[PDB]
Amino acid sequence: DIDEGLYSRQLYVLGHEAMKRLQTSSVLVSGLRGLGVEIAKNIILGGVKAVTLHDQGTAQWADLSSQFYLREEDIGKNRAEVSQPRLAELNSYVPVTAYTGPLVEDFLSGFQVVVLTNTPLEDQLRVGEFCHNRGIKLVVADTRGLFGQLFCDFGEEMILTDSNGEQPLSAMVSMVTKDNPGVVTCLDEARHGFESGDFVSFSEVQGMVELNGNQPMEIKVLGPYTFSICDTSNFSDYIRGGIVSQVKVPKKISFKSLVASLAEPDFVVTDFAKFSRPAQLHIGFQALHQFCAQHGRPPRPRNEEDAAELVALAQAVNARALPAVQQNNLDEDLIRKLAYVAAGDLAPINAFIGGLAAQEVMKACSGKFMPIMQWLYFDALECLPEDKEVLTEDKCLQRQNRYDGQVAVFGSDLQEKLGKQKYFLVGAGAIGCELLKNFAMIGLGCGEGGEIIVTDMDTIEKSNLNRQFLFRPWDVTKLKSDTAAAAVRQMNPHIRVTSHQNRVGPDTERIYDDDFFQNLDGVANALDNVDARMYMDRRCVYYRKPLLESGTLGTKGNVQVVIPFLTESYSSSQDPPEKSIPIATLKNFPNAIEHTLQWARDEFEGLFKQPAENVNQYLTDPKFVERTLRLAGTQPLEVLEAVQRSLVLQRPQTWADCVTWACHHWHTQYSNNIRQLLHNFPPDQLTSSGAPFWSGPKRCPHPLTFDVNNPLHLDYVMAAANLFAQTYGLTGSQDRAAVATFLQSVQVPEFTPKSVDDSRLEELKATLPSPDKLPGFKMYPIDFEKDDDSNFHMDFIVAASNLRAENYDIPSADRHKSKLIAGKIIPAIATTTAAVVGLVCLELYKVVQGHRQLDSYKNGFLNLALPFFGFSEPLAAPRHQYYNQEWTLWDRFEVQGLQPNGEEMTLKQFLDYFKTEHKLEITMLSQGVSMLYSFFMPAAKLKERLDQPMTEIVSRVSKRKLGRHVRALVLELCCNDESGEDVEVPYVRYTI
Amino acid sequence: MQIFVKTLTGKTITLEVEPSDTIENVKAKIQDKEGIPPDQQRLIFAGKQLEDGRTLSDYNIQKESTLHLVLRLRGG
Numbered sequence A: 001d002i003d004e005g006l007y008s009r010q011l012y013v014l015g016h017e018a019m020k021r022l023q024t025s026s027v028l029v030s031g032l033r034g035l036g037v038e039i040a041k042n043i044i045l046g047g048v049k050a051v052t053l054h055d056q057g058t059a060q061w062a063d064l065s066s067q068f069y070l071r072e073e074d075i076g077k078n079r080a081e082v083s084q085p086r087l088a089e090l091n092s093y094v095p096v097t098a099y100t101g102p103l104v105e106d107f108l109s110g111f112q113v114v115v116l117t118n119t120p121l122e123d124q125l126r127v128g129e130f131c132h133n134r135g136i137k138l139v140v141a142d143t144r145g146l147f148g149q150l151f152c153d154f155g156e157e158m159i160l161t162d163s164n165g166e167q168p169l170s171a172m173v174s175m176v177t178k179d180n181p182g183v184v185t186c187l188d189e190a191r192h193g194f195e196s197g198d199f200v201s202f203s204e205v206q207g208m209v210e211l212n213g214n215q216p217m218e219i220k221v222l223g224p225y226t227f228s229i230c231d232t233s234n235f236s237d238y239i240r241g242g243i244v245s246q247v248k249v250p251k252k253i254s255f256k257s258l259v260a261s262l263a264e265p266d267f268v269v270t271d272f273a274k275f276s277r278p279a280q281l282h283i284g285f286q287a288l289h290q291f292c293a294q295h296g297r298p299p300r301p302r303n304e305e306d307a308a309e310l311v312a313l314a315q316a317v318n319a320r321a322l323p324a325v326q327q328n329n330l331d332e333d334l335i336r337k338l339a340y341v342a343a344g345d346l347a348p349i350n351a352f353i354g355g356l357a358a359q360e361v362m363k364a365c366s367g368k369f370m371p372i373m374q375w376l377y378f379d380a381l382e383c384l385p386e387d388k389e390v391l392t393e394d395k396c397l398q399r400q401n402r403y404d405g406q407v408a409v410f411g412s413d414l415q416e417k418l419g420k421q422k423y424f425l426v427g428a429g430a431i432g433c434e435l436l437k438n439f440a441m442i443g444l445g446c447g448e449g450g451e452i453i454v455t456d457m458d459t460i461e462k463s464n465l466n467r468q469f470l471f472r473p474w475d476v477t478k479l480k481s482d483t484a485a486a487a488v489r490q491m492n493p494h495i496r497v498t499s500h501q502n503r504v505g506p507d508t509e510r511i512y513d514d515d516f517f518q519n520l521d522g523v524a525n526a527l528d529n530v531d532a533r534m535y536m537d538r539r540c541v542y543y544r545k546p547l548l549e550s551g552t553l554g555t556k557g558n559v560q561v562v563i564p565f566l567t568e569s570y571s572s573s574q575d576p577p578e579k580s581i582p583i584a585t586l587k588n589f590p591n592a593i594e595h596t597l598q599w600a601r602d603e604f605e606g607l608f609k610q611p612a613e614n615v616n617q618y619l620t621d622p623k624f625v626e627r628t629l630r631l632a633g634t635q636p637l638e639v640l641e642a643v644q645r646s647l648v649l650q651r652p653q654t655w656a657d658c659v660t661w662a663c664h665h666w667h668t669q670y671s672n673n674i675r676q677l678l679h680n681f682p683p684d685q686l687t688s689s690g691a692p693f694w695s696g697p698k699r700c701p702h703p704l705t706f707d708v709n710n711p712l713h714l715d716y717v718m719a720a721a722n723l724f725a726q727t728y729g730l731t732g733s734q735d736r737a738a739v740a741t742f743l744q745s746v747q748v749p750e751f752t753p754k755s756v757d758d759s760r761l762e763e764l765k766a767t768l769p770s771p772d773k774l775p776g777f778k779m780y781p782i783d784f785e786k787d788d789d790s791n792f793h794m795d796f797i798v799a800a801s802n803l804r805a806e807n808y809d810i811p812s813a814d815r816h817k818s819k820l821i822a823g824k825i826i827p828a829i830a831t832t833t834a835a836v837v838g839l840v841c842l843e844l845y846k847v848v849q850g851h852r853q854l855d856s857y858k859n860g861f862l863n864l865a866l867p868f869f870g871f872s873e874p875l876a877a878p879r880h881q882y883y884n885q886e887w888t889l890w891d892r893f894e895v896q897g898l899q900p901n902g903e904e905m906t907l908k909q910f911l912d913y914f915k916t917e918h919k920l921e922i923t924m925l926s927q928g929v930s931m932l933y934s935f936f937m938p939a940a941k942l943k944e945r946l947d948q949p950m951t952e953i954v955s956r957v958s959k960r961k962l963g964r965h966v967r968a969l970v971l972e973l974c975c976n977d978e979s980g981e982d983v984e985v986p987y988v989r990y991t992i
Numbered sequence B: 001m002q003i004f005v006k007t008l009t010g011k012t013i014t015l016e017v018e019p020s021d022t023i024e025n026v027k028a029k030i031q032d033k034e035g036i037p038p039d040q041q042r043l044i045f046a047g048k049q050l051e052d053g054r055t056l057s058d059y060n061i062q063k064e065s066t067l068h069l070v071l072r073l074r075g076g
């Protein structure tokens, strides 16, 4: 009953069960400041039952530095009333309401979760006692400039169905013992990965029927391949085979009251370098609430006496605490830094904690992740200028400007820098929208000499609306970049955003040429693949521009910053590759559902798109036959045969001819090939070790007969015949009754499994119909589309995967799970996306101010399902050395290509230049993939290259002349130094 | 001593090492229990990233200390 089209990317992070528990949960958001609107944004996008806003204060100027829904013409009104229609637009399924002041006990009764933001502590204590004693989930989140806190109180009895968010792992059973604590041994080359205390379940274990289908039993990890189970004394005798399935059991946790947790705090560390800070910041926020009782206002920005008042108050709060919470040492400077940025309201900090606080609300009414227990304190104190002595009398003083909440922390001069920044945003997806929103609130590119370049090739799909809040369901079929700019120009009219629709890569080097990266001050990535990340990384090294890299995956996030001449690049480190299924266990011996889904996706590409693309190239390119005959072995015959099939053999003319093909391919793929496989490998053949072949990762298949009444057999023919007719351009019907009536009249050719090659190829080149014989005929390839439930695409994969799963006795999967593996959908949620982008813009405050110390930067790593928060300083760029000169990744060789005379530098002058000016005996020279010079060159190759200029050599080997736009050239070297032996050296910028 | 290594899956690993051991030897022990090459391990401790060639005493790692095996991600 839930809209899988809208929540597609989110149902892969919460699941249908936890989503249904969201549909029936009302949330109250109190305080619509910068932090309050951020929390409410992700909650509405998450899909709760209903959200209710609440606020008593007016929309002051100091609130526009982070609230992206308070326009400049709404100052003075009620924040909850004006931002209600804007928040109610994000999700057409969640009604949003506001309230105008009373926080009475009867009002809180109609809510399940209550969020308290920017509310005095004494006013929070009354709400905390009531909600906990009546079973109302409580979330308290406050942000004070660079600092911020987050608190949760989900009652003293909360059931957790999932405490880590990770999918259950599986393993295959080798041997199990009949001891009192039975010992299970997994297969070799496949670690179980389980933990002591986990619960597993057994299946397909023959010889111990009592162990199969049992309920969760505790396990103890005895090693990387063994673990123990329950009692196995009075069980049967084990034989062979089996599969272990990890199961997560629901466990209960308890939360203390707000008034009790404030006295007995349980902390969750955000920065492990700041381990002793959550205890100190717990006293600072209490003194900040009591500060509003002495002076009736937040402390003034910077200032000396107002900072000394918090130090005097914090010492009194420390003495009045319990003798286990009282700290023997008080950090005077940390509380004085808190008084300076107390009156500040920054968009990044609000976006970060607002993303976390919104995620805690998701855990409250779903029990899907481990919540924060119970306090979470975070500070971005490194964003301040390094030791710089700036006065508050000119800068931090409020100017009745929209940036008062941000200038009060940094200053007017640091605000003028942002207005003159030019940044390049690569992508307008989930991270792209959050960055444009923070750009508008921060103020970067909002001046006379500032610009924000947004480029993105994708159009707005229905699934994007769950996390990309700058888009609306009527913005479908529009460019993301153009639409996202129009949404930001309304949040801040001063911003200047240019929206391109160019796919960033090697083809668009003309648009983003050398002159483009010159006036840039930095680049911010928002990409969903690793190839574009590596491409943007190499260019930021060639042009020496800062890069802000970020990535998400479900509840996980990471942030890495690359500063020129300071840190290593994104490509310096390596990441583990994706799950690569061996071709053997993919084509013949599958064991999991992923092996059939990956097989069904390859069936779609090779059965519909691949033959049509070959026929079109055969009918368009006159040099197609010669091209295919040139490449590889047993590949010309595979492609030439496919052309003969699609042109004459398997060529349809009527819809009925497509139904017979779908029935013939069914018997060939799920019956004939299965009998052919069983012929080469009988169902009880032994291996070289005398062991049964069909054991463990190899499941014994069985042929499948065609039953016209079975819907799974019919669902396959309907989707196959339609996609087959679309390839040839024929009208396909959807009447499942007439097709089934027609299937009972189709004849299937007999099949008997079976136990110079160029001579067959010499006949095919002569038997192929000439393109002049049939003029007019053309086929149409079919691009795979996952998010369309009408093109029969997912209808084919599910039917193709589950039919193969029945052959190998594999449990099938629904079309929702099949869409995850075959479509390769990466799960994403709005709370994680907003959390990392807030951390990205924190380091952005350091880039625009120019930090040269590695201590100031922080690389972020998040996992909101644990919850985990870790930060580490970026690694300094690796320093290598050849003889007396040492070089860094950011260093280059500058070689002027053309000379005192108009002629170009030659290869000989190039080699001798490094021997006399740099003392480098060059022994290997290459530009890209082509090699130019090496010590092992043939004598003839060296003669015809020494006197030729460098551009003439590259164009000679690369078969492509250099374009007119090429202004410089990158060269790789492997030379010998003055020491004696081979040595690596920087690259060369060869300016033409 | 006895150090802990926690991953992004909540999986906590127990190791038996000595303060004289190097970072390179620690990454070799992780591969013998989890199967991750040292080039794919990102270890964090006290706000610093563990680099090869260093020792456990350079980063000041006492007994009962926790390391974090993090990862970078692709979606966006």
Ligand SMILES: [Mg+2]
Pocket (backbone or CB within 6 Å): A458, A459, A461
């Ligand atoms: Mg898309």
Ligand SMILES: [Mg+2]
Pocket (backbone or CB within 6 Å): A528, B076
């Ligand atoms: Mg994507």
